[PDB]
Write a protein that binds this ligand. Structure first.
Ligand SMILES: [Zn+2]
Lengths: 188, 74, 21, 183, 29, 88, 204, 117, 50, 103, 58
RNA sequence: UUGACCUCGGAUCAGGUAGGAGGACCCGCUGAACUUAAGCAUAUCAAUAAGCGGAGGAAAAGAAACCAACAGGGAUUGCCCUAGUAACGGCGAGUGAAGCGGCAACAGCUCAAAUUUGAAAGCUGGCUUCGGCCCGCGUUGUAAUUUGGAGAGGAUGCUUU
RNA sequence: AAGCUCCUUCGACGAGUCGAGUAGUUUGGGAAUGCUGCUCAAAAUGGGAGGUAAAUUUCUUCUAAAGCUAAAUACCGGCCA
């Protein structure tokens, strides 16, 4: 679902957990990518998502839970594949300094640059991020236009729901000094 | 008549066109039998005949399949 | 038997022993 | 130590030397019969690690099997069908093991090791005369060869629960009602 | 030496084998 | 857990399964000269000589199936180029 | 026209295929073989060090047994056996190695010229595993080596080494790295010309 | 839970006293072949793996090579005098080594070994 | 391209000056044969027994 | 030289290349396979014809590739008005005899 | 079943199997255990009288 | 010209072996439907019945590319509980294990990868006056040594046939 | 002939097989539970399976692709009781 969102995204196969974490940077250089979205799974049940700028930038590790994909027949919403979204952020994203780092990594990963040849020319969906608990809740919505009674916008949920729990923020690419630690994370 | 005398099972069940016995399958090396008929199996199983050799094996097992002649025999 | 088996039985055979109560 | 060099050469099956030899031998085997006898193994390193000796009683047979499918999938490998056809051809011998030799777009090729259980050299020699015992009649028919053990899932671990100690045996033990005298 | 004369005859039987096998059908004749 | 005094064990010869044999590495290098190169290894050799190192690793993953296998295969083939220009 | 048997046709087809096919250089080097003189001079030394037959070994065991009932130097002998010679080459004990050129699985000896060159041992590809097979008292022998000789003919072994490594190894230094085959005759050249003529209008 | 054919797969254990007699005669048979020797081999004392059973202890398969050497029992002699040997198990602590060495010593004190032929 | 390139000897061009095996040699390669003496003593028993 | 796509499998490679599914780089890279670097120049006809019968690579074809081949190789008088008319008349008559037999 | 009926009709003798066992139940020979073994006693009862142990396990 | 080796043949050649039966239990292959879900199509019946091949008094499995996270266990098999639990199914009809633990019984081993190279030391025949005579197989490898909780080789001193 | 000991010497371990992709079947078991076919096709301080948010894949435990082996287990048939 998330790869269909990103026209500037390239899907990549199973990565060896016995490898080193900075070999992702050598991998992304090969595919000529400055962002890595890493889906790391533990015990065949848990999911961890990594966002990183590849050579030198920051890296954040989340714990992903409460996953609901597009194939679930209770969403009733659909949008163009590759269209440029409107990114809805929260006020807490601009107050906390660690949430400011996460917001910029979210703006790079889900950006869909302006003149991209694989993108779509019209706007019909909004990707939302919200800090309610000590976690980040991610929702998609469809911009549906309704004629005004003598036009207005209604939102219909399209796609993936997942809650991200911020575990750590690194200064290096996939390893380095620790700038933020959760210290409240209860692991599965 | 569509059936003649078979030469393996003795029944008048050898087809005169296919030349195959409908009871045992004579040109086949294996004797015909099926598991959906226990009645047909018990009609041709061991013990339905004379047992020329298989009736003599258990006595020779009892004495250890021995050879020779008892000592002092004329 | 193999001659490697025969050598092991020649020098380390099964012994006769008892355990007191 | 020529056989260690031969082992590394068979690792590189796509190299110039091996692909040339496997080409000219695939044509040669197609000019011959589907099942025929080889005087010597074409892969002497592989046969020797599988239990071949240059003794009277050991023979090598070459066999083709038509590759592909029946969308139904056969539960035994093409190596198993190769072993059963050689064993039917040589009914007096015992199938010990078999190995891949060549592969075409129509046929897979195997070489089967056979042991004569009535040859005096085999019978007097321990570490091979277990095959003379009547419990080893037609091992390839009952899945006791190397490819048979892989197909029946006879491996230790939590990933082979249904297939250790027999699939039908383990299913039967789990589906009988056990009633004791004092219930 | 270069097997030219042996190659002449080997191709001759191969052509003869192909024409004989293909002529077993009445359509090809 | 429980406080039990630890003891150090003998190095297991099965733990030495990680091969360091000088003779086997000799045999592998000598056979590689004798056997030659696979058709796909020639594509990797040509791409490494032309400088397209990124294309070589992408192609070798698509032939082998793993980043670890693609990384090693380009590393053995890189040293073949290094030792070939030394002999030449 | 008359029909050949299958086995006659099959081995004659293989003879043609050896000439026409371009073989890799490890296979190609086994085509080049030392001449009549150097073969005959090598067997003049190897026949002096022939391993003893089963009959005269039993006589020597019987003679030394009869003397005991009523002091020997180390035996010097042509070394044979593939796993034996490969161990001698790797341990740098073989002074001269003679390899057969018609081993039916050719992989058994395909590495031996490269192994002798890396180890520095002079080697020569002989013509015939039967002629090597009759030097030892066997039927075939894939490889034959000399480790040490007696004091009388250390000079003749060294002359034969200088003969082989200069009268055989220098000619194959030119052509052992290149592919063999391609001995296309008159009929094959006409058949290739007919092929390329057909692919000039419309490749299908 | 009778959706299958349970009537053709049902085992009744009426041979419970019969198999007890068979097992006791099998124990008597190996006491006749090995007349002064015990009918069982000596087995080590091990700790149960999981945290539920750490506090309890039980008999293991065979004695380790290291605890066999510290007690003075050679390797190739231990199966001949009725001691089970496990080459897979490891000591990993001095507590498991000391308990088995003392157990092997107590077996040595109570042992009568006959002088070969 | 060159469909049949020549072999570049990158490994065999450097000559190895030492044996591969650093294992010691046994005494039996330096002394008379123990197997030979056993077959001789077997023959001595046969001539002595006739 | 004229390149004529007759086989359905070459049509399948053409449908893949002409659409944005397989690039020029992917076709060149995947041509380095086990069927590559095999000579066919001076080889005898009995050797080569045995190989061509038994070395056809097994890669699937698509139904649209096969549909393009039959409509490319259809003759100009394959389906005229006369033959389509008698074919429909033959099929109608065949149903009439069945109704006569069921009568 | 039909073979069992064939024996009842036939005038062939029933081959009675003597009760032979693969393994003996009492010690034999001329040694201290075989002379002091009691057939009517059990394994534990005999080893009590001998003063030895029978089972080394739990 | 003669003689070797390789491949392939012939013989009512010398000596052997396979087929069929039985199939209660055992090892594989192939493989339904009725039924239930008050109908039925996923599912269930069922990895069953029918069909095909192959053994024995048992067969099979079997000495960890195992379980585990421990203060650790220690080849395989079977019983008791684990447990209608985990896990998977519109999270329906439902399907459904395993580790630990308590017992029964316990037994460990054989090769390939190393050159005997100061001595193919190995073995099939068949002629015997029964002790030893030849014909061969085999160096493209038959004996001895070694089989990774190991081992080799030297040295060393006791201990075993 | 054999067991141990010591060491300024050595210590070889199974490939169209693992693995990736796909189709079918199967399982309580898409970390695909196992199996089979097709395409591509490996490694040597290596490989496999696990534990772990703990800061980087740290730690734990085993060596697959060769082979043999009694007992405890089953039994509507065989020789009997
Ligand atoms: Zn009949």
């Amino acid at each position: 679902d998330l790869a269909s969102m990103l026209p500037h995204g390239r899907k990549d196969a199973k990565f060896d957990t016995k490898s080193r974490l900075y070999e992702l940077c050598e991998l992304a250089e090969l595919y000529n990518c400055n962002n890595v979205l890493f889906f790391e799974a533990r015990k065949g049940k848990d999911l961890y998502m990594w966002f990183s700028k590849v050579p030198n930038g920051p890296t954040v590790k989340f714990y992903a839970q409460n996953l609901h994909t597009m194939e679930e027949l209770h969403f009733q919403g659909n949008c163009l594949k590759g269209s440029r979204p409107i990114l809805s952020f929260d006020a807490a994203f601009e107050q906390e300094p660690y949430l400011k780092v996460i917001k910029e990594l979210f703006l790079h990963t889900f950006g869909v640059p302006q003149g991209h040849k694989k993108s779509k020319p019209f706007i019909d969906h909004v990707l939302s991020f919200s800090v309610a608990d000590g976690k980040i809740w991610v929702r998609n919505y469809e911009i549906r236009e309704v004629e005004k009674v003598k036009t207005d916008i209604n939102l219909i949920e399209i796609g993936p729901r997942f809650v991200l729990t911020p575990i750590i923020i690194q200064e290096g690419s996939f390893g380095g000094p620790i700038l933020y630690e959760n210290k409240r994370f209860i692991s599965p | 008549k569509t059936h003649g005398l078979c030469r393996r099972c003795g029944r008048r069940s050898l087809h005169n066109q296919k030349k195959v016995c409908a009871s045992c399958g004579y040109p086949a090396a294996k004797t015909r039998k099926y598991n959906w008929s226990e009645k047909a199996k018990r009609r041709k199983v061991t013990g339905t005949g004379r047992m020329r050799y298989l009736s003599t094996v258990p006595r020779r097992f009892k004495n250890g399949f021995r050879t020779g002649v008892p000592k002092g025999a004329r | 038997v193999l001659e490697k088996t025969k050598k092991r039985l020649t020098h380390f055979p099964q012994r006769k022993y008892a355990v007191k109560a | 130590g020529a056989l260690k060099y031969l082992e590394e050469l068979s690792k590189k099956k796509q190299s110039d030397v091996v692909r040339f030899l496997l080409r000219v031998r695939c044509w040669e085997y197609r000019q011959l019969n589907v099942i025929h006898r080889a005087s010597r193994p074409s892969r002497p390193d592989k046969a020797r690690r599988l239990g071949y000796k240059a003794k009277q009683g050991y023979v090598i047979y070459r066999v083709r099997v038509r590759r592909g499918g029946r969308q139904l999938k056969y539960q035994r490998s093409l190596r198993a069908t190769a072993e059963e056809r050689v064993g039917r051809r040589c009914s007096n011998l015992r199938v010990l093991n078999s190995y891949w030799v060549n592969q075409d777009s129509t046929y897979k090729y195997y070489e089967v090791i056979l042991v004569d259980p009535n040859h005096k050299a085999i019978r007097r020699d321990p570490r091979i005369n277990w095959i003379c015992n009547p419990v080893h009649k037609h091992r390839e028919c009952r899945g006791l060869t190397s490819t048979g053990k892989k197909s029946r899932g006879l491996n230790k671990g939590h990933r082979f629960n249904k297939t250790r100690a027999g699939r039908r045996k383990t299913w039967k033990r789990h589906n009988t009602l056990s009633l004791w005298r004092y219930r | 030496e270069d097997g030219d004369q042996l190659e002449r005859e080997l191709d001759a039987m191969y052509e003869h084998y192909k024409e004989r096998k293909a002529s077993q059908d009445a359509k090809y004749r | 857990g429980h406080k039990t005094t630890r003891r150090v064990l003998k190095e297991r010869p099965s733990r030495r399964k990680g091969a360091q044999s000088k003779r086997t590495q000799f045999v592998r290098s000598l056979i590689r000269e004798v056997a030659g190169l696979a058709p796909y290894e020639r594509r990797v050799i040509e791409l490494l000589r032309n400088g397209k190192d990124k294309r070589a690793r992408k192609f070798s993953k698509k032939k082998l199936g793993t980043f670890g296998r693609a990384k090693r295969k380009c590393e053995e083939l890189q040293r073949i180029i290094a030792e070939s220009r030394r002999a030449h | 026209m008359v029909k050949w048997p299958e086995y006659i046709r099959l081995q004659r087809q293989k003879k043609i295929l050896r000439m026409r096919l371009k073989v890799p250089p490890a296979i190609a080097q086994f085509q080049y073989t030392l001449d009549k003189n150097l073969a005959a001079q090598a067997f003049k030394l190897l026949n002096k060090y022939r391993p003893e037959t089963k009959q005269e070994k039993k006589e020597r065991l019987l003679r030394e047994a009869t003397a005991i009932k009523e002091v020997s130097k180390k035996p010097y002998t042509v070394k044979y056996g593939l796993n034996h010679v490969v161990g001698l080459i790797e341990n740098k004990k073989a002074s001269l190695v003679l390899i057969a050129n018609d081993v039916d699985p050719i992989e058994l000896v395909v590495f031996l010229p490269a192994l002798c060159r890396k180890m520095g041992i002079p080697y020569a590809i002989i013509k015939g595993k039967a002629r090597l097979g009759t030097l030892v008292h066997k039927k075939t022998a894939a490889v034959v080596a000399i480790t040490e000789v007696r004091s009388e003919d250390k000079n003749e072994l060294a002359k034969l080494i200088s003969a082989v490594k200069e009268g055989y190894l220098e000619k194959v230094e030119d052509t052992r790295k290149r592919w063999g085959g391609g001995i296309m005759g008159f009929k094959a050249q006409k058949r290739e010309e007919k092929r390329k003529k057909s692919l000039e209008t419309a490749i299908k | 839970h009778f959706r299958k054919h349970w009537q053709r797969r049902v085992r009744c254990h009426f041979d419970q006293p019969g198999k007890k007699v068979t097992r006791r005669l099998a124990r008597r048979a190996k006491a006749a072949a090995l007349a002064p020797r015990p009918v069982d081999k000596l087995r080590p004392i091990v700790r149960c793996p999981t945290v539920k059973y750490n506090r309890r202890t039980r008999l293991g398969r065979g004695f380790t090579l290291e605890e066999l050497k510290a007690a003075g029992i050679p390797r190739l002699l231990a199966p001949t005098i009725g001691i089970a040997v496990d080459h897979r198990r490891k000591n990993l602590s001095e507590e498991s080594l000391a308990a088995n060495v003392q157990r092997l010593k107590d077996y040595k004190a109570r042992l009568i070994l006959f002088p070969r032929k | 391209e060159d469909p049949y390139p020549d072999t570049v000897e990158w490994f065999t061009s450097v000559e190895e000056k030492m044996p591969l095996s650093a294992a010691p040699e046994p005494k039996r390669r330096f002394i008379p044969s123990k197997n030979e003496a056993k077959q001789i003593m077997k023959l001595v028993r046969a001539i002595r027994e006739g | 030289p004229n390149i004529d796509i007759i086989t359905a499998e070459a049509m399948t490679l053409a449908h893949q290349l002409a659409t944005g599914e397989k690039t020029k780089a992917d076709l060149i890279d995947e041509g380095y396979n086990k069927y590559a670097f095999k000579q066919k120049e001076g080889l005898p006809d009995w050797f080569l014809e045995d190989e061509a019968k038994h070395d056809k690579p097994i890669k699937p074809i698509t139904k649209e590739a096969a549909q393009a081949i039959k409509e490319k190789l259809r003759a100009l008088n394959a389906r005229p008005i006369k033959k389509v008319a008698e074919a429909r008349a033959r099929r109608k008559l065949r149903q009439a005899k069945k109704l006569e037999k069921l009568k | 079943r039909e073979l069992q009926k064939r024996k009842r009709r036939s005038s062939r003798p029933t081959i009675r199997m003597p009760n032979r066992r693969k393994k003996a139940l009492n010690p034999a020979g001329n040694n201290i255990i075989a002379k002091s073994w009691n057939k009517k006693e059990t394994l534990s009862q005999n080893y009590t009288r001998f003063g030895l142990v029978a089972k080394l396990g739990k």
